[PDB]
């Protein structure tokens, strides 16, 4: 019922910031619209306020602003994103404006982004598996609804192809156990060409009733790149706990998000933190991640698979080393496997899930999941060791078991890991492939497999 005053007291412009003069009673994170002298419109966010002063960070840059013709019309808001159940199946810009040639969202609620945290008393341990279609993920590094598992990558590695495959093939394992699965897909600072890739994948996927592609290009303004993952997390939280639907979220290149936070912090004249990244970057990433988890009072859940780029192909970088503690896993993409032309280059042996035991079980998935996972792990290690030995022992002195492990390693690299870009694989047939590889060894040789399982499956 209050029409916000449109101050015209610009008294300083520098970089992305504009300092108003005599604003009456601002708000710290208010949102403000700017009508330049030429009539064009820009939206800006309000940073630190002071006595009658309010520094405004302006989207889309600050070119053309003049201290005698630019009006700064306040709103008195904190960026309540419009949220509704029909937000699904549409592509959205970085700031939420639809770009799918459709109408703006008619909202069932205006939820403020950066939502309040879950009460730790109300959380519940994650359970059941989430089928992704990639054998290396659903066999040896299983994923459970409620985890927060990073996908560590590096520049040049095909992170986005794996992202698209996860977005398309994701499903619920409980099909044979006896459709409330939604995939909020967030992409921060993608390249100009991969934008076409994402648009094509989300324009011919075949399951559009599930995904919601929040998209933020590289040349889009930075503050949009900060807000985009928060918008995506808010929409996912709504669709999970306010609509009782299982939700999966893929955050692409959160290293770009960290760089965006670094860019914003510097503009506020704050001293840079450790290794250049601000010290509050730990708090920011914890705020982004911890929104996941399973709530006892709600039937929904949030599972995150944030894709992170590790610069210089090492984990010592502040962002991967920092996100290692918060999360409970690491699915590395290995450069050498990409060189070896294995399309999913996931280094399975280095990769692990800190809580992969919950996904493995009797009710969910299949009984032999843990046994086959451990056997595959151990046999791969042995095969790698045997290949290394054969590199130096001439391979003539290798015993029969050494040759068995060598051929198993070759088969595992060239038939199991190298899944096609579109070869969707249910966990049951993935485990059938695992048993196909395993049955080469004698039944007595599979030491890691417990009894009553070999008799069940080793007979094929």
């Amino acid at each position: 019922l209050e029409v916000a005053m449109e101050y015209r007291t610009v008294t300083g412009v520098a970089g992305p910031l504009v300092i108003l003069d005599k604003v009456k009673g601002p708000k710290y994170y208010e949102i403000v619209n700017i009508r330049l002298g030429d009539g064009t419109m820009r939206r800006g966010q309000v940073l630190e306020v002071d006595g009658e002063k309010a520094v405004v960070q302006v989207f889309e840059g600050t070119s053309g602003i003049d201290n005698k013709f630019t009006t700064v019309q306040f709103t008195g808001e904190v960026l309540k994103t419009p949220v509704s159940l029909d937000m699904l199946g549409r592509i959205f810009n970085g700031s939420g404006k639809p770009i799918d040639n459709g109408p703006p969202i008619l909202p069932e609620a205006y939820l403020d982004i950066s939502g309040s945290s879950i009460n730790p008393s109300e959380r519940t341990y994650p359970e059941e598996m989430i089928q992704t279609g990639i054998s290396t993920i659903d066999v040896m590094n299983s994923i459970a609804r409620g985890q927060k598992i990073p996908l560590f990558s590096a520049a040049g590695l095909p992170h986005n192809e794996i992202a698209a495959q996860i977005c398309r093939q994701a499903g619920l394992v409980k099909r044979l156990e006896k459709d409330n699965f939604a995939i909020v897909f967030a992409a921060m600072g993608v390249n100009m060409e991969t934008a076409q890739f994402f648009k094509r994948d989300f324009e011919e996927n075949g399951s559009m009733e599930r995904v919601t592609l929040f998209l933020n290009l590289a040349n889009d303004p930075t503050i949009e790149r900060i807000i985009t993952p928060r918008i995506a997390l808010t929409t996912a939280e709504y669709l999970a706990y306010e609509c009782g639907k299982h939700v999966l979220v893929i955050l692409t290149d959160m290293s770009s998000y960290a760089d965006a936070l670094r860019e914003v912090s510097a503009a506020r004249e704050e001293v840079p933190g450790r290794r250049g990244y601000p010290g509050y970057m730990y708090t920011d990433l914890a705020q982004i991640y911890e929104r996941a988890g399973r709530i006892e009072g709600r039937k929904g859940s949030i599972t995150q698979i944030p894709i992170l780029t590790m610069p210089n192909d090492d984990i010592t970088h502040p962002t991967p080393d920092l996100t290692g503690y918060i999360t409970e896993g690491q699915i590395y993409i290995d450069r050498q496997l990409q060189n070896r032309q294995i399309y999913p280059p996931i280094n399975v042996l280095p990769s692990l899930s800190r809580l992969m035991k919950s996904a493995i079980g009797e009710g969910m998935t299949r009984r032999d999941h843990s046994d086959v996972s451990n056997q595959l792990y151990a046999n791969y290690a042995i095969g790698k060791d045997v290949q290394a030995m054969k590199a130096v022992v001439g391979e003539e002195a290798l015993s029969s078991e050494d040759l068995l492990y060598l051929e198993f390693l070759d088969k595992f690299e060239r038939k199991f890991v190298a899944q096609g870009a579109y070869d969707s694989r249910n966990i049951f047939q993935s485990l059938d492939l695992a048993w196909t590889l395993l049955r080469i060894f004698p039944r007595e040789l599979l030491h890691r497999i417990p009894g009553k399982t070999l008799d069940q499956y080793y007979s094929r």
Binding site: T11, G12, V13, A14, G15, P16, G37, T62, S63, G64, I65, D66, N67, K68, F69, A155, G156, P158, E161, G189, N191, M192, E193, T194, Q196, R200, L217, A218, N219, P221, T222, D253, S256, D259, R262, E263, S265, A266, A267, E269, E270, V271, P272, R275, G276, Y277, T309, P311, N312, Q336, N339, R340, Q341, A388, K390, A391, V392, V393, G394, E395
Partner: protein
């Protein structure tokens, strides 16, 4: 209007500006230096001077212009050399006999008195025209026609179109009436240096670059309208790759904007390209100066001019793409550009970020690179054109942790990472095949399939061979080749042959000056076929030995084929495809004769 208050380096604070918008170019002092606004604090506004600031007074008048940094477009833009602020260098050198560039010279970017021929594109009176519609064509020079289009911000009905004949830029070649008012248009078109030209819609590239060099065109390809990044190396890199992209590329024109580089190198480039008789047409030897353009700004040039040079270069790319040509712009800058940002940011008292570079470096590099990509043009007829950005990165003396390098690799799609170790070994194309990558390998699937339906498999096999050799190099560094088996030995032999035959190129001789795609793919297929047949033979194990014994057998009793394989690089492209293809097919047949004749007597 306004007067100077403070003069520190290239940063000038002039009071009395009041209503002076950001980036609104102002003219400083009696000498009338160009200059752009960078900050405001009230009645005063910071200015970047783009020129030497020595001799500025206090209360020296500063005149505002209300116009952001703008470059003047039109005919004759091709084949010229422009300063970062787009001053015609040759025009300055001729009009003023002095060999120097005088301070504060005011020369039009394009000559306004040269007579140009006008060919209207059948536009009738009373017709309707719109932004970017292509109403007339002008032959700026032979083998490079220049279409003339309305500016994107223009529309109306065609009341008057000039007839065909000789015209100068001062004349009005077209008239339009819209919304009850009329406007006129000349052959000039001023455009802000930022705010990229409008595009009807972007597109996903399919055509490869197919550059002259074999490594680039085969292992790590780039698409027309793509995006690349080389580490600005000398001897290699900034010279051989620049020559290949300029005189031996399928791009319809070149825009060299290398700024912040050595003056001697710039003089060498600007004296060698005048002759440069590349056979760009089917049967013509027109010099590429009728095809390229330089925006050279040497290192000694003012620090504030680097960004202006880069943005004018990319803006010129856009004008040509809009006409329809597939321009390819090469920037030897962006290594000095980061330094320019550091200088201005520090002088403007901005808070630094990781490694001292301004926090918004990634944003600027993105706003530059993301202007690449092939684009469906504005206006009528329907048309398509592309812009390629083959930029530069810090030389291979610093790891990828460099903020400029990380920012580039976070955006750039193809990385031609040259390694200094290869440069020491005098391998001249010098691309490190372990660290380079090309994310365009998936979009080029159609072109590779239609050209040769088996090239993808042989390329993957070559990649696997190179990776395997690089993998066991460490093991050999410990134990040695004593334990190497038949497969390892043959893999290393093929890797060495690939390294010295395929991946090398002299480029100073007709053997390797320009390798067409067919010759490169034939070399790859020959080498991979030899590798596969040799592996199959050593796996056969006939004669109770096979293995490394068979490897020595094929390296000694069958080594003439090996020598012909390693000398296949010398197939002269001037002989023509029907001859080289026949020669390579014969060599393939002879190779198939081997490893079968070798298997005849069971080794």
């Amino acid at each position: 209007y306004g007067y100077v208050r403070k003069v520190s380096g290239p940063v000038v604070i002039a009071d009395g500006m009041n209503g002076a918008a950001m980036y609104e170019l102002v003219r400083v002092g009696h000498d009338n230096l160009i200059g752009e606004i960078i900050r405001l604090e009230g009645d005063s506004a910071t200015i970047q001077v783009y020129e030497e600031t020595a001799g500025l007074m206090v209360n020296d008048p500063v005149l505002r212009t209300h116009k952001p940094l703008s470059v003047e477009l039109g005919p004759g833009i091709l084949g010229n050399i422009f300063d970062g602020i787009q001053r015609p260098l040759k025009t300055i050198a001729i009009r003023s006999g002095d060999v120097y560039i005088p301070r504060g010279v005011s020369v039009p970017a394009l000559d306004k008195d040269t007579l140009w021929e006008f060919q209207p594109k059948k536009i009738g009176e009373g017709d309707l025209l719109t932004g970017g519609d292509l109403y007339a064509t002008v032959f700026e020079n032979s083998l490079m026609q220049h279409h003339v289009a309305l500016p994107p911000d223009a529309m109306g009905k065609v009341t008057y179109v000039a007839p065909a004949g000789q015209y100068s830029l001062k004349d009005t070649v077209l008239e339009l009436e819209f919304q009850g008012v009329k406007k006129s248009f000349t052959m000039l078109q001023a455009w802000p240096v930022r705010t990229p030209r409008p595009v009807s819609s972007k597109l996903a590239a399919d055509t490869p670059l197919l550059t002259g060099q074999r490594v680039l065109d085969a292992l790590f390809p780039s698409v027309l309208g793509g995006t690349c990044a080389i580490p600005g190396a000398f001897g290699c890199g900034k010279t051989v790759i620049s020559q290949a992209l300029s005189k031996y590329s399928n791009s319809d024109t070149v825009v060299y904007v290398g700024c912040g580089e050595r003056g001697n190198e710039m003089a060498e480039v600007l004296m060698d390209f005048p002759q440069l008789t590349m056979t760009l047409p089917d049967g013509r030897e027109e010099s590429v100066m009728k095809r390229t353009t330089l925006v050279a700004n040497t290192s000694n040039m003012p620090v504030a001019a680097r960004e202006a040079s880069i943005y004018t270069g990319i803006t010129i790319a856009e004008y040509f793409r809009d006409m329809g040509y597939n321009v390819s712009m090469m920037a030897d800058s962006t290594s000095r550009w980061a330094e320019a940002l550091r200088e201005i940011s520090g002088r403007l008292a901005e808070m630094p970020a990781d490694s001292g570079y301004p926090a918004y470096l990634a944003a600027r590099l993105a706003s530059f690179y993301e202007r690449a990509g092939k684009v469906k043009c504005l206006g009528g007829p329907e048309r398509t054109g592309s812009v390629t950005i083959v930029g530069a990165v810090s030389p291979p003396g610093g790891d990828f942790s460099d903020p400029v390098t990380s920012a580039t690799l976070s955006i750039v799609q193809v990385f031609w990472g040259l390694d200094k170790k290869l440069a020491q070994r005098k391998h001249f194309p010098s691309v490190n095949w372990l660290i380079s990558y090309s994310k365009y390998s998936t979009a080029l699937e159609s072109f590779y399939e239609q050209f040769d339906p088996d090239f993808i498999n042989i390329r993957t096999k070559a990649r696997e061979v190179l990776q395997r050799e690089d993998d066991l190099n460490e093991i050999v560094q410990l134990v040695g080749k004593d334990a190497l088996a038949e497969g390892d030995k043959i893999t290393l032999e093929t890797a060495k042959l690939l390294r010295e035959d395929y991946l090398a190129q002299n480029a100073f001789t007709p053997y390797d000056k320009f390798c067409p795609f067919y010759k490169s793919v034939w070399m790859m297929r020959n080498i991979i076929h030899f590798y596969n047949l040799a592996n199959q033979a050593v796996e056969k194990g006939a004669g109770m030995d096979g293995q490394k014994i068979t490897y020595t057998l094929i390296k000694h009793r069958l080594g003439d084929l090996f020598y012909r394989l390693v000398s296949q690089k010398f197939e002269d492209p001037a002989e023509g495809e029907p001859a080289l293809v026949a020669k390579f097919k014969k060599l393939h047949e002879d190779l198939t004769a081997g490893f079968r004749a070798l298997e005849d007597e069971t080794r």
